[PDB]
Design a protein around this ligand. Structure first.
Ligand SMILES: CCCCCCCCCCCCCCCCCC(=O)OC[C@H](COP(=O)([O-])OCC[N+](C)(C)C)OC(=O)CCCCCCCCCCCCCCCCC
Ligand SMILES: CCCCCCCCCCCCCCCCCC(=O)OC[C@H](COP(=O)([O-])OCC[N+](C)(C)C)OC(=O)CCCCCCCCCCCCCCCCC
Ligand SMILES: CCCCCCCCCCCCCCCCCC(=O)OC[C@H](COP(=O)([O-])OCC[N+](C)(C)C)OC(=O)CCCCCCCCCCCCCCCCC
Ligand SMILES: CCCCCCCCCCCCCCCCCC(=O)OC[C@H](COP(=O)([O-])OCC[N+](C)(C)C)OC(=O)CCCCCCCCCCCCCCCCC
Ligand SMILES: CCCCCCCCCCCCCCCCCC(=O)OC[C@H](COP(=O)(O)OCCN)OC(=O)CCCCCCCCCCCCCCCCC
Ligand SMILES: CCCCCCCCCCCCCCCCCC(=O)OC[C@H](COP(=O)(O)OCCN)OC(=O)CCCCCCCCCCCCCCCCC
Ligand SMILES: CCCCCCCCCCCCCCCCCC(=O)OC[C@H](COP(=O)(O)OCCN)OC(=O)CCCCCCCCCCCCCCCCC
Ligand SMILES: CCCCCCCCCCCCCC(=O)SCCNC(=O)CCNC(=O)[C@@H](O)C(C)(C)COP(=O)(O)O
Lengths: 19, 144, 150, 84, 81, 110, 133, 59, 446, 100, 96, 111, 53, 48
């Protein structure tokens, strides 16, 4: 399973959960 | 390192100013070619390729920037927006002229509009009368 | 009940209608206190013609009743248009014959609205409609009705 | 999933299906002009044969920079990103 | 590219559609080296022919459809008729 | 021509030096590891930026510039203003004369 | 790292014309046997003509370029995975430094991969100091 | 899967069964509506000739 | 009212206390919540306290001012990370917001003028203090000298109106009507510069670019609307003369909208393209204002309210790429879908709000503005279609070229997106779709 | 595999300590979302008739009930009564611009 | 592709008007209403000649893809085991 | 070509499209019978029949609507009754296919 | 919401439901049928006919 | 066989390129707005 080079999505998910 | 530092200067009237402007824009002197001395025309900026757009340039060449198809320290053309890969560029030169395409399209359109609107009152019809609808004042008859 | 589709729709309507009627008559209808709310009635303040030019007390009151009468007449035209829309929906094939008195009444309402509030602009004072009425009555006196004037 | 042995088999199969190349003289290190008798247009036929075989486009500079079948193997393995 | 074959498997004379081109080029006085690269492309076992593919495509379920139509006719006469 | 190949070779040497500068500066681990974002310093990008911003310094009131500023901006403005004034005056004289009915006038805002 | 040189020889020009002519012939004739027959016809047309001089070859090369521009197909066949194809560069891979900007709790999902990346960082910085430093 | 200079890997029974099933479904629908309603392809109602009617009835 | 004014007056000493940057925006959002509570307003002036009162136009403009300044403190965290002068920045923002509240809740023309031209000095201070360009001197001098040169004879016009009438109040000046050319030119041309024309715009694209993010918010969010508010207050007593001279300004504004919409297709800066984008929509606002219809005035108020949010939200989007990619150039900003994919939601949600969008208040402002201009003349259907087509021809270009394509090579490592930025572009778009609900609030000020 | 608690990724509000990030983040989300967008929208949903649009519809329904009962006009064309207004005479006006 | 070719077969003959399918039921009810109504000469030319064009391109769409000689590369990935995909195809096939 | 083309060549011989009977209905001396409606106006408008389908036999369309609503959605159960309504239209079409044709004969006898 | 608190004449912002007449075929109750509403006040009432005022 | 698409090449280009209609929309009538936007910038926005 090759590892895709994705940017960080932690801040968007934390923003969604805080909202 | 700002816009006041690197900017186009006055027009190269003499040859030594043309050589200094060619060396300033990281261009060989033979390649450099300034604009005209008219009111709209830029001063001291190089006149790059206005023949055909970015799609005409070689995509198999190893570029420093594969996007925009340019190397490092290469002078960007002044109408880089109009001659970009997105708008008004072709990978190969067009087969015909610009007026042949429009001429054939409006010729076919003028023929089709003319032949349709000439025949607008020659619609065919079945051997059929008007559709009879019942009215309290006007009565209709059967054939039996 | 005369069709399988009609019986299925009746069953779906009964399953839909049951619990909401239980929630209304069992929970919503009890524990609701009885209170009275009233439609607001406004007395008729004298208009823009029955007061002096130097007084700004009358201009505010006549402007406010002109705005209120504008909103009421807009609702007259809106309800008269909705009557024609309900005529078009309720008389779906035969809307040509029945909706004609309503359309004539609505067209008369639009004509009278354009007589009173027409061509006044965004800043329509009570005095502007009165001066428009003065010039309209003068033009009706000397040039006949508008549309065949000289 | 590919391999260097598989791509080598592809290159020698396409170059041995060419009737103007003798399979006895054919080798992975055999030069296309000095060792084998090929025209200037024959190498273009070999290049478009590799293009139709491997399913991409080879540019003209990379067409003239290939002189051996091992060079074609190294060019294909660099483009399709296999080294084992 | 698993289990690739050799060049001795591919022969020009096995297929008609390439030996027709070879005969036309011999009539014109020319030869061609890339016929053996396209021998696999026309195979009667792996790929079939033109007439077998049309009968496979146009009439894939004609027999099953006719059998189901006979079944529908046979069950329709027992109930409707 | 033999002069063409020397020019192309000199341009290729200059392009090779600029390419080596780009490969040195683009994969810089220290400049990446500073954490402050940015770009590799390209001269032509800054030349393009100051070309797009500053353009009055090369401007002179010639006949070609006057023709461009007349036929590009002032003439469509003048023709559009004349057309709007003519249409509004033609409708306004019909409105003020009284040639149109009350119930037969467009845009009653109703 | 051989950057290609922009000068094109006359033999390279006629080889490029031969390649583009056979690509246009492949676009025009879809069946492989008819394309092969016409390709051998065009190869014989080139092979009867290769014995001339240089100036006549240059003029007839310009005539062949004009002819190939005249007979060019409106929808030329191209490979999909190569440049200029129907599905070239459908996905864009961002550079790996955005992997360095992940959350540490997001970095905990692949700890062996991030440990190997941190091991490879020292090898890259010594390689960069060897190469350009 | 990948295949080189040969056919595909041999198909499963489910694909062949499904292909014959949907071909039988289409052709069963076609021949069933051909048998039950043959009149829809031709004229559902007859078209008598307008020059065939006698002039002695109206004329 | 006096509660909001004294709230900001006692929020003034928050700046002098150290580590107090984030409490001021908390109290600003609290007073925006309180101003959401005090909403008992009708078309006439209510909450009359001395010389301060409020009607529905003033309510919407003060609420927009409070929201833009509250988001302006949220957007500027670059002032807080560096040791740039936070106390002076907070004092300038509070003073400027207080001046905007005072010039919008002004009962009279003169106090509106006084706080209206008091507002340009904190904008001058933000532009020449907190910008990041060598041409901030060219930015602030163009703005101040353009607005001052055309607004000084407006003071002569204002006292000519005072000498002819007697009063300064808006309602008593609504009764009168003047038939003078030069009074009309004095009382109009200052607002005709303060909202962008085609000919007089220059201060706008050369003052938006060289300013900070906060200068961009305060210029494209509420200080293109001071001229709109001024024309909404002045046009009521200059109807006869503006009906004589309005075809020139409407034709110039419509052709200039088409031409500036053609300019943005040839723009290589993100912050300059939104700067010219403010010219095109306010051209439609100016073309719908001078027709004097109910629909033109209501749709102009709705489009100014819905434009002050969306242009400021677009200017926050160009800032969060300028902080990371290091430049505002459109060539550098390419392929940000693979860098910040979660930001691309807010890019397209705020670029679609610049054009006609399905849930936004901008469409309800644009529909009610094109109604009045097509009603004004039939010749405008040719050039409204061209302008409203070219608007999304250029506005899709900024999202398309910045947020799609191959990545710009040779970009160094920058930080990822933050929750503050997602919250900042959340509050620039959810007011645009929550205000179509209760839209009779933000449209019917008459 | 086990990340350190001292290696904390900041939010957008402060870049010096973790305490000021959480307090400002929670308070800024308090003063915008659950005050200005939810409680403020709940207040604006149940806002009374500031504009008189509901009263205009009720008065229009009652007026259309009472005007067609009298039957004079559904919408009155005149602002005042035509007998109450005293128009000037033709000799009084002279050459004045009468606008229609 | 036995099942995919069968789906492509059913949908092309539905498009051309294989009797008693959906496209036939729509196309005959459109086209014979034209013949009993007032239609222009050029409009009646543009209907039926374009229907012949429709069957002509739709059977040409067959011939290059199916019932013809392969012209692809030496390496192909032809398979018919994508069963979620073909389950969606079965649902739309029986509905069509 | 065809029926339109003769209208370009002989307009006085061939009548126009959807032509009404110009001459007398009793000129042929048949004393032909009068078509009498079975369903009147109020049950025609009760069934929501469209104005393009209020023909001389709308009672068969009313019965077809009743049988469609009786076995909905499986409306094929009295499918032949649809043909009954259809052949009434065909009978009307036959009358129309006579009402044109004898008119041409009436336009030929005067020519 | 749509059958117990729909839009009435005292409120503008509700969902104002307008229904068309159902088709009456024989086999239904009352096949000789005309329009029940004929007055102009019956059209688009929104519950105005049951008002206490 | 005679290639009926290579013969009548001008007719097959018109029928093949969808009546020359992508050229008319794209690379036709787009130079005339895009260059004219630059003439506003060069002459009237910055010069005049
Ligand atoms: C540049 C500023 C705007 C100029 C155009 C607008 C304008 O003044 O329109 C008034 C008028 C519009 O014309 P007009 O509509 O008043 O003309 C009516 C003419 N008759 C009565 C014969 C029907 O502008 C002009 O006449 C001149 C336009 C500008 C000419 C060149 C100016 C260069 C500086
Ligand atoms: C143009 C500048 C010079 C104007 C000179 C004439 C003014 C005058 O005397 O008006 C008297 C007229 C008449 O005044 P009056 O009505 O008080 O007349 C009383 C009669 N006398 C004078 C004999 C006692 O004023 C007006 O019509 C009203 C305007 C008053 C304010 C005038 C300001 C002048 C400046 C105009 C600038 C317009 C453009 C602004 C934007 C661009 C700025 C560059
Ligand atoms: C400048 C911006 C300053 C900050 C503004 C912050 C947002 C405030 C929004 C206030 C308006 C609002 O939401 O009104 C609620 C509105 C007010 O409307 P209402 O319920 O009063 O309905 C009557 C009003 N008219 C006539 C316009 C319909 O509430 C609703 O519409 C209720 C349903 C909402 C839809 C579903 C939402 C998701 C669940
Ligand atoms: C869950 C509770 C909240 C949601 C709900 O049910 O709301 C009910 C309400 C309606 O019920 P309501 O309005 O009767 O209830 C509110 C009652 N008061 C006023 C007392 C507070 O809202 C909706 O149904 C919202 C529908 C939205 C549809 C799309 C609107 C935008 C269209 C724009 C077109 C023009 C563009 C330019
Ligand atoms: C008779 C025939 C009438 C045809 C009318 C066509 C109208 C325009 C259609 C849209 C054209 C367009 O912009 O195409 C998109 C194109 C995208 O790039 P493309 O050219 O496709 O890529 C190849 C390499 N350049 O885009 C571009 O290349 C340019 C991107 C910017 C385009 C700006 C808008 C130009 C539109 C054409 C001018 C006419 C506008 C008319 C408006 C009428 C409104 C009612
Ligand atoms: C910054 C931008 C500032 C723009 C200011 C514009 C000021 C000029 C306005 C011109 C105008 O409105 O002129 C109207 C006038 C015709 O007006 P009117 O009285 O209706 O016509 C008499 C009919 N018998 O028309 C005229 O008087 C004609 C004007 C001609 C101007 C020629 C300029 C040449 C340069
Ligand atoms: C109104 C004015 C509009 C003017 C627009 C411009 C002119 C349009 C002219 C329309 C008629 C075109 C006639 C043919 C001209 C072009 C011929 C051609 O280029 O054919 C090439 C090609 C077959 O060539 P081949 O080598 O076999 O194929 C491999 C590569 N193509 O051919 C093909 O692939 C297909 C060619 C089809 C030609 C015949 C069309 C179909 C006829 C039969 C079906 C319709 C029957 C209808 C009958 C009832 C009519 C009422
Ligand atoms: C489809 C359209 C095709 C357009 C034209 C294709 C066929 C036309 C005939 C050949 C076209 C030419 O111009 S061939 C080049 C002319 N030069 C010569 O061949 C004469 C001698 N010149 C040479 O150096 C030749 O050896 C070559 C063939 C140019 C070099 O290639 P090899 O090294 O022989």
């Amino acid at each position: 399973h090759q590892m895709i080079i994705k940017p960080s999505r932690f801040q968007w998910d934390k923003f969604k959960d805080l909202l | 390192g700002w816009n006041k530092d690197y900017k186009p200067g006055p027009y190269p009237q003499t040859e030594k100013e043309r050589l200094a402007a060619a060396k300033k824009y990281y261009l060989l002197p033979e390649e450099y070619k300034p604009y005209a001395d008219d009111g709209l025309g830029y001063g001291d900026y190089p006149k790059l390729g206005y023949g055909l757009g970015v799609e005409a340039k070689d995509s198999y060449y190893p570029w420093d920037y594969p996007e925009h198809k340019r190397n490092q320290h290469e002078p960007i053309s002044a109408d880089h927006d109009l001659y970009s890969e997105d708008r008004w560029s072709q990978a190969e030169p067009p087969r015909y002229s610009n007026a042949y395409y429009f001429a054939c399209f409006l010729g076919v359109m003028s023929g089709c509009l003319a032949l349709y609107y000439w025949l607008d009152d020659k619609k065919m019809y079945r051997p059929v009368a008007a559709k009879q609808y019942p009215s309290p004042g006007v009565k209709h008859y059967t054939f039996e | 009940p005369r069709s399988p589709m009609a019986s299925f729709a009746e069953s779906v309507l009964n399953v839909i209608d049951g619990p909401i009627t239980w929630f209304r008559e069992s929970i919503v209808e009890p524990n609701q206190q009885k209170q009275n709310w009233y439609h607001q009635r406004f007395r008729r303040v004298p208009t823009i013609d029955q007061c002096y030019t130097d007084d700004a007390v009358c201009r505010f009151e006549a402007d406010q009743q002109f705005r209120r009468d504008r909103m009421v007449d807009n609702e007259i035209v809106n309800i008269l248009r909705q009557r024609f829309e309900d005529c078009t929906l309720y008389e779906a094939p035969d809307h040509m014959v029945k909706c004609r008195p309503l359309m004539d009444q609505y067209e008369k309402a639009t004509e009278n609205w354009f007589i009173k509030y027409g061509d006044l602009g965004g800043y329509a004072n009570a005095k502007t409609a009165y001066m428009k009425q003065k010039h309209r009555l003068i033009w009706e006196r000397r040039h006949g009705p508008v549309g065949s004037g000289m | 999933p590919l391999s260097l042995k598989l791509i080598n088999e592809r290159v020698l199969l396409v170059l041995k299906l060419y009737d103007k190349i003798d399979p006895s003289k054919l080798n992975v290190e055999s030069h296309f002009i000095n060792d084998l008798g090929l025209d200037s247009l024959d190498h273009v036929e070999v290049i478009m044969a590799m293009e139709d075989e491997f399913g991409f486009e080879i540019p003209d500079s990379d067409a003239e920079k290939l002189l051996k079948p091992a060079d074609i193997i190294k060019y294909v393995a660099d483009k399709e990103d296999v080294y084992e | 590219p698993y289990t690739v074959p050799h060049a001795s498997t591919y022969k020009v004379e096995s297929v008609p559609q390439l030996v027709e081109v070879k005969e036309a080029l011999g009539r014109q006085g020319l030869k061609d080296p890339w016929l053996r690269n396209e021998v696999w492309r026309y195979e009667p076992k792996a790929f079939g022919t033109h007439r077998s593919r049309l009968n496979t495509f146009l009439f894939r379920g004609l027999g099953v459809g006719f059998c189901a139509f006979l079944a529908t006719v046979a069950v329709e006469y027992a109930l409707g008729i | 021509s033999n002069e063409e190949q020397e020019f192309i070779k000199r341009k290729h040497e200059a392009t090779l030096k600029l390419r080596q500068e780009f490969l040195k500066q683009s994969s810089n681990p220290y400049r990446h590891a500073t954490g402050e974002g940015g770009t590799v310093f390209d001269a032509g990008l800054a030349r393009f930026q100051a070309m797009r911003v500053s353009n009055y310094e090369h401007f002179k009131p010639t006949g070609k510039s006057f023709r461009t500023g007349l036929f590009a901006v002032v003439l469509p403005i003048a023709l559009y203003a004349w057309a709007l004034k003519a249409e509004r005056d033609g409708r306004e004289e019909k409105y003020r004369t009284g040639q149109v009915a009350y119930k037969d006038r467009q845009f009653k805002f109703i | 790292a051989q950057v290609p040189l922009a000068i094109v020889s006359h033999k390279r020009q006629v080889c490029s014309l031969y390649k583009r002519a056979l690509r246009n012939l492949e676009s025009w004739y879809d069946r492989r046997n008819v394309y092969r027959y016409r390709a051998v016809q065009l190869r014989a047309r080139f092979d009867e003509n290769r014995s001339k001089d240089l100036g006549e070859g240059i003029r007839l090369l310009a005539c062949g370029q004009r002819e190939l521009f005249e007979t060019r197909h409106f929808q030329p066949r191209n490979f999909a995975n190569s440049a200029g194809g129907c599905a070239f560069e459908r996905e864009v891979i961002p550079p790996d430094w955005v992997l360095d900007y992940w959350h540490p709790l997001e970095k905990a999902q692949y700890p062996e991969y991030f440990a190997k990346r941190e091991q490879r960082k020292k090898e890259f910085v010594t390689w960069w100091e060897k190469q350009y430093g | 899967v990948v295949s080189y200079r040969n056919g595909p890997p041999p198909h499963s029974k489910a694909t062949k069964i499904g292909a014959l099933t949907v071909g039988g479904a289409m052709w069963w629908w076609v021949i069933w509506h051909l048998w039950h309603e043959p009149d829809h392809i031709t004229g559902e109602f007859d078209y008598p000739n307008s020059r065939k009617w006698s002039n002695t009835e109206l004329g | 009212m006096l509660k909001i004014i004294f709230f900001l007056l006692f929020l003034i000493p928050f700046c002098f206390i150290n580590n107090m940057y984030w409490m001021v925006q908390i109290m600003m959002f609290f007073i925006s919540f309180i101003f959401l509570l005090m909403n008992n307003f009708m078309n006439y002036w209510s909450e009359i306290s001395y010389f301060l009162g409020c009607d529905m136009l003033s309510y919407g403009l003060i609420l927009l001012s409070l929201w833009i300044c509250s988001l302006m403190l949220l957007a500027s965290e670059m002032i807080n990370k560096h040791n740039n002068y936070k106390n002076l920045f907070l004092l300038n923002i509070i003073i400027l917001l207080l001046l905007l509240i005072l010039t919008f809740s002004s009962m009279s023309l003169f106090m509106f003028y006084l706080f209206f031209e008091s507002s340009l000095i904190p904008t001058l201070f933000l532009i020449l203090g907190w910008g990041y360009q060598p041409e901030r001197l060219q930015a602030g001098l163009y703005l101040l000298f353009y607005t001052l040169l055309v607004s000084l004879p407006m003071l002569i016009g204002i006292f000519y109106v005072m000498n002819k009438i007697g009063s300064m109040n808006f309602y008593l000046m609504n009764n009168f009507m003047f038939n003078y050319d030069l009074l009309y030119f004095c009382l109009l041309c200052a607002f005709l510069v303060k909202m962008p024309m085609f000919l007089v715009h220059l201060w706008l694209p050369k003052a938006h670019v060289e300013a900070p993010v906060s200068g961009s918010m305060i210029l494209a969010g509420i200080m293109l609307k001071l001229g709109g508010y001024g024309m909404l207050r002045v046009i009521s007593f200059l109807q006869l003369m503006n009906l004589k001279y309005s075809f020139v300004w409407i034709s110039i504004s419509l052709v200039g909208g088409v031409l500036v919409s053609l300019v943005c297709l040839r723009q290589t800066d993100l912050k300059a393209l939104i700067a010219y984008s403010s010219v095109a929509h306010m051209g439609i606002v100016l073309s719908g204002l001078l027709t004097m219809t109910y629909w033109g005035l209501c749709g102009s108020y709705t489009l100014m309210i819905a434009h002050g949010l969306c242009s400021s939200g677009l200017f926050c989007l160009a800032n969060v790429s300028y902080e990371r990619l290091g430049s505002r150039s459109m060539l550098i900003n390419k392929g940000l879908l693979n860098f910040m994919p979660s930001m691309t939601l807010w890019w397209f949600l705020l670029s679609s709000a610049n054009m006609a969008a399905p849930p936004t208040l901008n469409l309800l402002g644009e529909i009610s503005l094109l109604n009045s201009i097509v009603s004004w003349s039939w010749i405008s259907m040719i050039l409204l279609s061209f302008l409203s087509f070219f608007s999304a021809a250029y506005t899709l270009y900024l999202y398309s070229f910045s947020q799609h394509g191959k990545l710009f090579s040779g970009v160094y490592s920058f930080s990822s997106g933050k929750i503050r930025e997602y919250l900042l572009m959340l509050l620039h778009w959810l007011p645009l779709n929550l205000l179509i609900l209760k839209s009779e609030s933000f449209m019917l000020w008459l | 595999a086990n990340p350190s608690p001292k290696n904390w990724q900041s939010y957008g509000f402060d870049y010096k300590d973790q305490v000021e990030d959480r307090k400002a983040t929670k308070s800024t989300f308090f003063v915008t979302v659950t005050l200005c967008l939810v409680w403020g929208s709940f207040y604006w949903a149940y806002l009374p008739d500031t504009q008189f649009r509901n009263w205009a519809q009720r008065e229009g329904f009652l007026e259309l009930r009472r005007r067609e009962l009298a039957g004079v006009d559904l919408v009155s064309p005149n602002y005042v009564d035509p007998a109450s207004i005293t128009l000037p005479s033709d000799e009084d006006l002279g050459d004045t611009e009468i606008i229609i | 592709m036995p099942l995919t070719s069968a789906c492509f077969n059913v949908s092309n003959l539905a498009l051309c008007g294989m009797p008693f399918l959906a496209g036939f039921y729509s196309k005959d009810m459109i086209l014979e209403i034209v013949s009993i109504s007032n239609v222009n000469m050029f409009s009646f030319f543009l209907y039926y000649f374009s229907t012949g064009l429709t069957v002509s391109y739709s059977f040409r769409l067959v011939y290059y893809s199916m019932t013809g000689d392969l012209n692809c590369g030496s390496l192909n990935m032809l398979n018919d085991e994508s069963w979620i995909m073909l389950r969606g195809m079965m649902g739309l096939l029986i509905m069509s | 070509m065809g029926n339109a083309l003769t209208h370009y060549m002989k307009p006085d011989v061939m009548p126009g499209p959807d032509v009404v009977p110009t001459f007398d209905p009793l000129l042929g001396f048949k004393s032909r019978k009068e078509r009498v409606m079975i369903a009147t106006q109020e049950e025609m408008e009760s069934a929501k029949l469209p104005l393009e389908f209020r023909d001389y036999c709308a009672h068969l369309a009313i019965a077809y609507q009743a049988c469609r609503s009786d076995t909905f959605p499986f409306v094929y159960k009295c499918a032949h009754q649809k043909h009954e309504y259809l052949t009434c239209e065909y009978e009307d079409y036959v009358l129309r296919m006579k009402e044109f044709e004898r008119e041409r004969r009436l336009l030929e006898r005067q020519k | 919401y749509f059958k117990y608190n729909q839009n009435d004449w005292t409120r503008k912002g509700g969902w104002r439901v307008i229904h068309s007449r159902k088709q009456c075929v024989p086999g239904d109750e009352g096949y000789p049928k005309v329009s029940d509403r004929s007055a102009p006040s019956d059209y688009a009432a929104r519950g105005f006919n049951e008002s206490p005022l | 066989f005679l290639n009926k698409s290579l013969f009548m090449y001008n007719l097959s280009t018109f029928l093949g390129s969808m009546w020359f209609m992508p050229y008319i929309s794209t690379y036709g009538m787009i130079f005339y707005p895009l260059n004219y936007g630059q003439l506003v910038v060069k002459s009237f926005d910055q010069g005049w």
